[PDB]
Amino acid sequence: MKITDLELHAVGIPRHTGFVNKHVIVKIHTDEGLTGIGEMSDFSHLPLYSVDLHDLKQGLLSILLGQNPFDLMKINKELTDNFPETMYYFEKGSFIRNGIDNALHDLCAKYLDISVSDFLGGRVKEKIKVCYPIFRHRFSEEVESNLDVVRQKLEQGFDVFRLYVGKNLDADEEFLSRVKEEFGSRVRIKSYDFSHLLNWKDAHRAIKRLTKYDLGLEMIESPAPRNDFDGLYQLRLKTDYPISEHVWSFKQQQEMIKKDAIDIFNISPVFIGGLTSAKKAAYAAEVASKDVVLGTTQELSVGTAAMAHLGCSLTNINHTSDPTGPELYVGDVVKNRVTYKDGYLYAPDRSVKGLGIELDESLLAKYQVPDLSWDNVTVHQLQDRTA
Amino acid sequence: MKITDLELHAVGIPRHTGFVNKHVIVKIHTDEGLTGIGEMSDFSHLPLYSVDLHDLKQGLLSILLGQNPFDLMKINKELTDNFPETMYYFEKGSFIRNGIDNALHDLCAKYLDISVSDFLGGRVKEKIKVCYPIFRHRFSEEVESNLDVVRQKLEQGFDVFRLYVGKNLDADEEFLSRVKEEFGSRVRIKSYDFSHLLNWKDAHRAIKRLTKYDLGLEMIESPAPRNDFDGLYQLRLKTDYPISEHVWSFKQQQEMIKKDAIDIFNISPVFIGGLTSAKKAAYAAEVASKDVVLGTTQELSVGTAAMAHLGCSLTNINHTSDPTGPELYVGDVVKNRVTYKDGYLYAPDRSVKGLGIELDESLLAKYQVPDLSWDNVTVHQLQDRTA
Ligand SMILES: O=C(O)[C@@H](O)[C@H](O)[C@H](O)[C@@H](O)C(=O)O
Ligand SMILES: O=C(O)[C@@H](O)[C@H](O)[C@H](O)[C@@H](O)C(=O)O
Ligand SMILES: [Mg+2]
Ligand SMILES: [Mg+2]
Ligand SMILES: [Mg+2]
Ligand SMILES: [Mg+2]
């Protein structure tokens, strides 16, 4: 059982709201004709440079060629050797490793004729509660449009949301005020995500005013600069609500655990390098008696299915999670997208071998892009995912 | 005075020893016809992917077009906004910002008809002592060849070297023993560089063994994993010799300062984003009463000229530095390469406006490569710069 070839399909898929993201669909072929499919999700984050895919294929092939896909520890070690963790939230190498590792999970599962779910420790639940993201308010005139989003998504089944905050506290506060007034308790906003925009003391003042509105609030996310472990800790001591932060490297995670800097570890395959690495991170959190939440970069159905299997296998996810990618994109590259119902993301049919997703070649062609080059976009839009 | 265009010239230049590095020569054009030259030095470091230069030029021009090159603070802020610091030694975004910023210095200095030296605070010295690098020993069988290197370079005038260690302690020690034996005190090895290969305790044991050979030893560099501030600190308390570490981000530098983790800050433009960023790092070190050494990624004459001017302006460099790029590369892209004599790097003629170097178009064409794609190379070779 050996890897013989690799394909990287670049696609560009816009969100209903306008932001255009580029992703790379992975295909790992083997001597026995079995192919694993994966996804290097959302490369459209800073830094503002793009990776040469022709060169990348050669580099990845040199690593993968001839290897036994079941040697996940060995392969992941070699992947990290060539694409080291950087202590950066959006390291493109993390997205790359993620795509190879989840494709390998698909491959192995298919070979054994089982769902990736059974390859990750089975099921603890069959679905995980998620939330729909509400855009960061830059100006107060945006409040009305965001309220419309909440009203429509609620009718569609999403009763839990998360709100990006920190740019215009007056606008954030007006939105929250309006939401409580119109929906009362019908809607919950489980997280206020600062996106590392404020120093911890400024975030503290912001949190103090935003928490005057508690619509089923579950956590305050990234309320300090990236890697400001001491700041997170000081804020954790001054905040009644749990503090959550993304895990983007093992070193960063180790430091947050050792300093007891946070309460909830936001873990997502794409930011840590794949399912193998995400599992390690999740288990490290478990060993430290810490809570976990499944984060997201907002991936397509392949990437979402992968994390759905992982999320449904963990015993330490006791809060609302974030992956709602397929709900944001106007299209996808699969025959059947993952399912969302009543605000829950369902793990794919446990009876279907592999990820439980099938690629649609006509869609890969439809959304094909020549490379991962950037289009005109501002820093504000890259941070808020707006257009 | 406004920026009107940008050119990025990829070049591939092998070292006498075999390793082939790719660099990017920068040209910033203005409405008045004045052009600044710069260098994005040595992209040939992990991660194993490459940046699309056609895309990069568009992104960089988007930032630079129409700007006044004298607005260094404003431009560097916008550069950092799009190519953020990642807490990673070899972030390619740092190499990119470095090339733009040193080109801007060349441009501004030329416009005013002065050397970049007078734009950076003048001179404190006219030359800086540097050292020649000795390859990391992976096998004891390499000792002989490395001794020949010392013999040859000493004859050329390099009486100070630095040694990469940590892979084969028995070989490291054999080499050091042989050097002392064959050269006595004629040669000095100012630094033993562990390249972050060992956890601090293992490093402690290695140091205790190696420091039995003190041939003018000045510092122990990177004796702990990347960003292991507490490990660096613990080692600083158990080691009599100064501990030095590279500065790859302001967050990392501030944490090392706050924890008094190291004694010497190894600062080089390429790893921190350019001359503007390197000056800030050097001044932060000065404010903290810390020593500084001019590090290197081994750049061509354009990049070496830039750092030479910086190095000769600082008052807190009281140890041997590392830039010997033009002595390692078989070729260059300039009319006259920077001068090295008796183990000293001389800053370019202070009477020559700009960086003090001139591009040789025929050489630029000679070493031109289609892109920054990777060729066959192993992780060991990338960390040891061997072939
Ligand atoms: O939790 C967060 O910070 C968000 O999921 C953040 O990662 C977004 O930028 C996301 O990646 C997106 O593209 O919408
Ligand atoms: O001090 C160091 O770690 C070296 O200068 C290191 O950066 C080398 O890898 C250098 O960049 C080279 O290309 O030789
Ligand atoms: Mg978040
Ligand atoms: Mg994303
Ligand atoms: Mg070093
Ligand atoms: Mg280098």
Swiss-Prot record, chains A, B:
Documented effect of changing residue 45 to Q: Loss of activity
Q: Which Pfam families match?
A: MR_MLE_C, MR_MLE_N
Task: Give the binding site residues for substrate.
Answer: 15, 89, 296, 385
Site (described: Increases basicity of active site Tyr):
162
What EC identifiers does the entry list?
Answer: 4.2.1.158
- Binding positions for Mg(2+) 1? 42, 45, 297
Q: What else is known?
A: The enzyme product is the enantiomer of the product obtained in the galactarate dehydratase reaction catalyzed by STM3697; the enzymes thus differ in their regiochemistry of dehydration.
The active site lies at 90 (proton donor), 164 (proton acceptor)
The residues that hold Mg(2+) 2 are: 193, 221, 246
Describe the reaction catalysed, as an equation: galactarate = (2S,3R)-dihydroxy-5-oxohexanedioate + H2O
**What's in the keyword line of the UniProt record?**
Lyase, Magnesium, Metal-binding
Write the protein's name.
Galactarate dehydratase (D-threo-forming)
Instruction: Outline what the protein does.
Output: Catalyzes the regioselective dehydration of galactarate into 2-keto-D-threo-4,5-dihydroxyadipate ((2S,3R)-dihydroxy-5-oxohexanedioate). Is not active on other acid sugars.
Asked whether the UniProt record includes Metal-binding among its keywords, one would answer yes
Q: How many cofactor units bind, and how?
A: Binds 2 magnesium ions per subunit.
Q: Which family does it belong to?
A: Belongs to the mandelate racemase/muconate lactonizing enzyme family.
A GO term for molecular function: metal ion binding
Q: Which cofactor does it need?
A: Mg(2+)
Matches recorded under SUPFAM superfamilies? Enolase C-terminal domain-like, Enolase N-terminal domain-like
Alphabetical list of PANTHER family matching this protein: D-GALACTONATE DEHYDRATASE-RELATED, ENOLASE SUPERFAMILY MEMBER DDB_G0284701
